[PDB]
Amino acid sequence: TARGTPSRFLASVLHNGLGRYVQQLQRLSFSVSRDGASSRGAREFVEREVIDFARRNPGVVIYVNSRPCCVPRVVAEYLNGAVREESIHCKSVEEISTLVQKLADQSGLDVIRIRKPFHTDNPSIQGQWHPFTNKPTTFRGLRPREVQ
Amino acid sequence: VKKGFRAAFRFQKELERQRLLRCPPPPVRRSEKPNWDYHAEIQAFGHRLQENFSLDLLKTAFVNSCYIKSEEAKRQQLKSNQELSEQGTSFSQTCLTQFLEDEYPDMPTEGIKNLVDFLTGEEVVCHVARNLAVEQLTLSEEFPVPPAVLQQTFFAVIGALLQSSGPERTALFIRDFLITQMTGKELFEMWKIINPMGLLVEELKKRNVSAPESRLTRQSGGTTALPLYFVGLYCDKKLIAEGPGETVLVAEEEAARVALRKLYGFTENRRPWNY
Amino acid sequence: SPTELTEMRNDLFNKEKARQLSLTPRTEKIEVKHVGKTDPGTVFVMNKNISTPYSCAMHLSEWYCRKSILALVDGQPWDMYKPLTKSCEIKFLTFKDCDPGEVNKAYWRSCAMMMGCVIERAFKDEYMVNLVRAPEVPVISGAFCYDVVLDSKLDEWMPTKENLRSFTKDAHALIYKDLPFETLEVEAKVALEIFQHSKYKVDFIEEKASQNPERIVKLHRIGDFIDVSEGPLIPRTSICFQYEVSAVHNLQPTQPSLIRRFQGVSLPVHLRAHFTIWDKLLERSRK
Amino acid sequence: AAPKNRRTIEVNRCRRRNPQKLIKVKNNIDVCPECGHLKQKHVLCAYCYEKVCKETAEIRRQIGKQEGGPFKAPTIETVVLYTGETPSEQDQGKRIIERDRKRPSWFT
Amino acid sequence: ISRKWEKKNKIVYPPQLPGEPRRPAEIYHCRRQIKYSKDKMWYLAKLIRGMSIDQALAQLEFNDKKGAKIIKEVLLEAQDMAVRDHNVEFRSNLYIAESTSGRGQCLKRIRYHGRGRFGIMEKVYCHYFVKLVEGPPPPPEPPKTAVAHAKEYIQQLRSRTIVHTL
Amino acid sequence: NSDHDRLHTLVTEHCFPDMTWDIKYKTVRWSFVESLEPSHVVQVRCNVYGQITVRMHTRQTLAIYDRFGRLMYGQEDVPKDVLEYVVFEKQLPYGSWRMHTKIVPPWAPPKQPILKTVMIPGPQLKPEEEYE
Amino acid sequence: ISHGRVFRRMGLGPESRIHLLRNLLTGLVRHERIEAPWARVDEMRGYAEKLIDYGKLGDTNERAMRMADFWLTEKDLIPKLFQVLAPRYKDQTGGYTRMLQIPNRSLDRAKMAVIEYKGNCLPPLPLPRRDSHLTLLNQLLQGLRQDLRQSQ
RNA sequence: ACUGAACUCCUCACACCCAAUUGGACCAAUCUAUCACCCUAUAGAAGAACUAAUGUUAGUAUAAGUAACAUGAAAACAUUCU
Ligand SMILES: [Mg+2]
Ligand SMILES: [Mg+2]
Ligand SMILES: [Mg+2]
Ligand SMILES: [Mg+2]
Ligand SMILES: [Mg+2]
Ligand SMILES: [Mg+2]
Ligand SMILES: [Mg+2]
Ligand SMILES: [Mg+2]
Ligand SMILES: [Mg+2]
Ligand SMILES: [Zn+2]
């Protein structure tokens, strides 16, 4: 639930779209096993798709360890320092491809509840409403029931 | 005892995670952690920024003098990035000055200098370098990289870009990664000032205008603990700027700040920067 | 400028402190034996010229620190913050001793010094203030006195009740600050260097140096306020609880200069008086 | 009547950590200027009282030895004398209790 | 059972740099398996929390509860070991940073009731723990002033945003 | 470094409690610097246990800290001159020459003073006893 | 409601209260100094004073003799009461007893008092002494006294 | 007039709101075969999954520091007194 979970506001990393778009994913690390059915899909992904992904994403350094700890994994490191570890255990080639593309597309910001679907640093152009907008002024600034 | 291994191993993994949360290991530079290839990382740096650096220049930009000294000290038992950082700092300051003076011709030279100081300051450049992964590729003698060294390396990278691709591409880089740091920022959030009323009086004297008359335009709950005052500064019975406040003095000071923003063309609703 | 005078006096005071501590290097272990009735025969292995009777009391217990206000070091009254100089016998003196005469004298002296600090820092800059002396008055006299010469501009002005209450308020501000009574046995040369501007203090230092076989002069500081005392003082201003600048009396020989005696009365935390008794004491001290 | 519900630790803490239940700090504890022992203002010093009780017990043992039997309360006054002491002119005609120790400083 | 309190005295810190504030000494002591209710012990522990060693000893010497004497003995032992083994210069320069009571290992006995029925009495035992920190007792938290209250309220007022809008 | 495993072989068991008891729960920064005069044997005597008395006049540095890392004995930088009469013992089949006992002459100068002050209580008095 | 009730309820009833006080008073006459619970000492103090008054009434007074016979359960104390205690206080008119509070009984934490007959041969109790006249407050008050005596 | 639903539309996605009962897709842990040899896979098995039986055993709460219980007095601890 929202009340039992942290939240944040919609944001980019370094104003990621103002001047130029910088892909926030910078490192992928596939720990894959030579043997073991758990990493069969990872092995097929390394054989058939990792090269094409690498040449599609020149800004991402991709490592293939070929000796994992525990389950086969992909560790995605982002520019803002975020590290997201995704197990690729028993996933098919297409499942791993979609997961890796999702990691490439997303930023390093936490996948938690986002309070507002929008973020403006300049919410007002004509001036934020205050009680004295739309209130007429009076001669000599006389408040109500003032004698002079 | 219950036979089995998987639950026990799961519990050990959870204990290890909790231990890492409670007593995290001291931070270690990314180079000393697994899955690191410096050449690939430094190539991907340029490819990420969509710029054709020269690899030798970038490698020189990322190596600091303190790193060289520490390496020689260790060897007892390389071209530093000094000139590249100096070139990058000088060019960045001049190009930021050009950008800001073209955008805000009414801004005084002091204001432009303070804005450039903010944009090239340790905090802003530190944040930009950290989120551009300069720190990961930076060769320094101590970790985490101190903000001064990080700023020096970032400007060294800018100088390397200058030597590799030219002033126009470097200007685009500066616009994209330092000019954007003032988006959403307020003029006097970036340029700290004292006595805005006095500074406004100085500016009006430069414009050969008499000192503005501070005058109470609107007020609310004057005798309470939560008053609202609107104070307007009038130039020959003409309102130039009004500002709110809790006390009349605070409202007058804020009206002075609003007048300065309007004079310098750094109003909140000014034309947004063009990219 | 008075601020310049205070800064220069503090600088000289700290210079002398540093010089003395440097002159006394290392850690020479002196033996001080507790000669009091309670806890007899306990020996403290203290550090020469660093350790204090306060440190010995801290070794004993907290009750000793709270109640002990003077130190008979080999039979001689010692300030609780005066660094010990040699192996000796120590006895701690409180207000509730059988014969607390020395403690009473020390309390009167320290209260007079606090009054002097208040007087110096009270008046406006235009008027000049010269603290001539704090006469050694008996406790039976009903008040401690501090003699001061004010600016000739104020040769007719007499403090009002509100002025006196402001003086007491400043004194209570000092008490709340709880400043320790730093001490130094200095050479008459350095004492005259510190108080060169004040002719009255200069001649008083000369008298004290003449009285002592050597040129040793006691200099006391509460905070930023250095003065010459006639004997040991209490540890901290927080010892004082009830404190009132009672009155000001101009002395009879006004022809050479106007010596105005500020008379006040005080009682420590250990000897608080009831409201009515305190009021009667105030009435007596206003004379 | 039985409780209708278990009382929570929150309620129980609010009850049993009330200032009415907390132990109050005593402010009548001081130090006996005689011997430096802790005493309450209105109560006798415990250590001094123990001294006096032990000496009184010794004197009473000597009194019992002198009397030698129940129902032998003397019809005359009593004086306690320590080593190196002699009955005074006033102490004449008063039974003497001899103590083997020397006169205590607090005894007079 | 757990015996971590005893181990807390055996941690050795690295030597401090000369340009570093002197680390106050910390002494952990305990008495285990006190024949006393932990609920009754809690009041004495709470009482002496935060007080100097001498003030706590004075307060405990005149308290009628059985646990007062036990806590006084524990505090005296802690003072002795503070001076002997933890390089505390002054005996009295110590204050009770922590004083708590814990449940001990308890024994079950039968309490005979009136109609051939019974209850299970518990022979309750409690532990008692102290941490003594060298130095003056920290000053009590000053009460909230009207100025501080008003400042907090005005800060809350200024923290307000226009919620659920752009 | 509290290398007790090596210290057991380096010094005799008669000496080990002296070596490692009072130094427990405190960091010592003992260091060695060039000696002043060459070491020489003094005398030797003698189921059968060897014994060699060796005189040294060296220069050493000491810095003993607390559990909390605060200095309590000796400056770490300034060295001191140490005169020692160390007696070694050997087992007579696989034992070696290990530090057995250091002889301190009565005329030896007093050791370095300690930073902290100390209180030494007098004789405690029972209720029936009076101080004399 | 116990407005004006001046006697405690002790022992097992009125007779038991009298017998308890009688035993305490007999102990006080025999030993001249008694520890007992503070309330019982406070209750017995009045009877101790009245016993001294009856002893002053005289050995030959029949009413005094009967009162002493009742109130002293050990009869060797009656000659003591009439020939030692009463002559000791012939000069005084009251305040024959001294009652002081004692540290609470270790057994049951009871409020304890020591009561003695003044002038006994036992070591003196550690009486509370007022502050010395030479303290600061006392010296200031002495100054006030002297000034008042001189002025008026 | 407006407000007004999970109705309807809108952007996107869809197997994803009945008791008993019934059909189906998955599946934790365990053991075995063979792997993996890192903590998994494909199968074969079965004492194979507990917010509920005034369930059983154990622990600890609540009621509650409550109900309730207990030692005649002084003392020289000899003794005496009630
Ligand atoms: Mg009863
Ligand atoms: Mg609707
Ligand atoms: Mg529908
Ligand atoms: Mg089952
Ligand atoms: Mg269960
Ligand atoms: Mg159940
Ligand atoms: Mg309970
Ligand atoms: Mg109840
Ligand atoms: Mg009951
Ligand atoms: Zn005493």
PDB file of N, CA, C and O in Angstrom, chain E residues 42-58:
ATOM      1  N   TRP E  42      12.446  -2.342  37.448  1.00  0.00           N
ATOM      2  CA  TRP E  42      12.391  -1.297  36.440  1.00  0.00           C
ATOM      3  C   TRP E  42      12.256   0.077  37.066  1.00  0.00           C
ATOM      4  O   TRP E  42      12.788   1.050  36.533  1.00  0.00           O
ATOM      5  N   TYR E  43      11.551   0.184  38.187  1.00  0.00           N
ATOM      6  CA  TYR E  43      11.357   1.491  38.799  1.00  0.00           C
ATOM      7  C   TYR E  43      12.662   2.040  39.350  1.00  0.00           C
ATOM      8  O   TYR E  43      12.951   3.228  39.195  1.00  0.00           O
ATOM      9  N   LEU E  44      13.472   1.190  39.977  1.00  0.00           N
ATOM     10  CA  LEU E  44      14.769   1.636  40.469  1.00  0.00           C
ATOM     11  C   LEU E  44      15.702   1.996  39.321  1.00  0.00           C
ATOM     12  O   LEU E  44      16.409   3.015  39.375  1.00  0.00           O
ATOM     13  N   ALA E  45      15.712   1.174  38.271  1.00  0.00           N
ATOM     14  CA  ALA E  45      16.551   1.469  37.114  1.00  0.00           C
ATOM     15  C   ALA E  45      16.154   2.794  36.473  1.00  0.00           C
ATOM     16  O   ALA E  45      17.007   3.638  36.169  1.00  0.00           O
ATOM     17  N   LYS E  46      14.851   2.999  36.278  1.00  0.00           N
ATOM     18  CA  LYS E  46      14.358   4.255  35.737  1.00  0.00           C
ATOM     19  C   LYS E  46      14.719   5.419  36.642  1.00  0.00           C
ATOM     20  O   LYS E  46      15.097   6.492  36.161  1.00  0.00           O
ATOM     21  N   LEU E  47      14.607   5.226  37.956  1.00  0.00           N
ATOM     22  CA  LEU E  47      14.941   6.284  38.897  1.00  0.00           C
ATOM     23  C   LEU E  47      16.370   6.755  38.707  1.00  0.00           C
ATOM     24  O   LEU E  47      16.627   7.956  38.585  1.00  0.00           O
ATOM     25  N   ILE E  48      17.322   5.821  38.664  1.00  0.00           N
ATOM     26  CA  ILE E  48      18.720   6.236  38.607  1.00  0.00           C
ATOM     27  C   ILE E  48      19.205   6.495  37.191  1.00  0.00           C
ATOM     28  O   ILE E  48      20.369   6.874  37.013  1.00  0.00           O
ATOM     29  N   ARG E  49      18.364   6.305  36.180  1.00  0.00           N
ATOM     30  CA  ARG E  49      18.758   6.654  34.821  1.00  0.00           C
ATOM     31  C   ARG E  49      19.164   8.117  34.719  1.00  0.00           C
ATOM     32  O   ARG E  49      18.467   9.007  35.211  1.00  0.00           O
ATOM     33  N   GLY E  50      20.301   8.363  34.074  1.00  0.00           N
ATOM     34  CA  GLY E  50      20.744   9.701  33.757  1.00  0.00           C
ATOM     35  C   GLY E  50      21.431  10.450  34.873  1.00  0.00           C
ATOM     36  O   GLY E  50      21.864  11.586  34.655  1.00  0.00           O
ATOM     37  N   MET E  51      21.553   9.863  36.052  1.00  0.00           N
ATOM     38  CA  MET E  51      22.120  10.544  37.202  1.00  0.00           C
ATOM     39  C   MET E  51      23.598  10.220  37.338  1.00  0.00           C
ATOM     40  O   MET E  51      24.087   9.216  36.818  1.00  0.00           O
ATOM     41  N   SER E  52      24.313  11.097  38.032  1.00  0.00           N
ATOM     42  CA  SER E  52      25.702  10.814  38.344  1.00  0.00           C
ATOM     43  C   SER E  52      25.782   9.618  39.282  1.00  0.00           C
ATOM     44  O   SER E  52      24.806   9.236  39.929  1.00  0.00           O
ATOM     45  N   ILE E  53      26.965   9.013  39.337  1.00  0.00           N
ATOM     46  CA  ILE E  53      27.125   7.807  40.140  1.00  0.00           C
ATOM     47  C   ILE E  53      26.874   8.108  41.611  1.00  0.00           C
ATOM     48  O   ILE E  53      26.206   7.340  42.310  1.00  0.00           O
ATOM     49  N   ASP E  54      27.388   9.236  42.101  1.00  0.00           N
ATOM     50  CA  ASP E  54      27.209   9.571  43.507  1.00  0.00           C
ATOM     51  C   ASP E  54      25.755   9.882  43.823  1.00  0.00           C
ATOM     52  O   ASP E  54      25.241   9.464  44.864  1.00  0.00           O
ATOM     53  N   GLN E  55      25.077  10.614  42.941  1.00  0.00           N
ATOM     54  CA  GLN E  55      23.665  10.892  43.164  1.00  0.00           C
ATOM     55  C   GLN E  55      22.849   9.609  43.173  1.00  0.00           C
ATOM     56  O   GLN E  55      21.958   9.440  44.011  1.00  0.00           O
ATOM     57  N   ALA E  56      23.139   8.692  42.250  1.00  0.00           N
ATOM     58  CA  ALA E  56      22.419   7.428  42.219  1.00  0.00           C
ATOM     59  C   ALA E  56      22.669   6.616  43.479  1.00  0.00           C
ATOM     60  O   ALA E  56      21.738   6.034  44.042  1.00  0.00           O
ATOM     61  N   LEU E  57      23.920   6.559  43.935  1.00  0.00           N
ATOM     62  CA  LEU E  57      24.213   5.822  45.156  1.00  0.00           C
ATOM     63  C   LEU E  57      23.504   6.440  46.350  1.00  0.00           C
ATOM     64  O   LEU E  57      22.974   5.724  47.206  1.00  0.00           O
ATOM     65  N   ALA E  58      23.475   7.771  46.422  1.00  0.00           N
ATOM     66  CA  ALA E  58      22.776   8.436  47.515  1.00  0.00           C
ATOM     67  C   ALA E  58      21.286   8.138  47.479  1.00  0.00           C
ATOM     68  O   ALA E  58      20.669   7.896  48.521  1.00  0.00           O
TER      69      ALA E  58
END
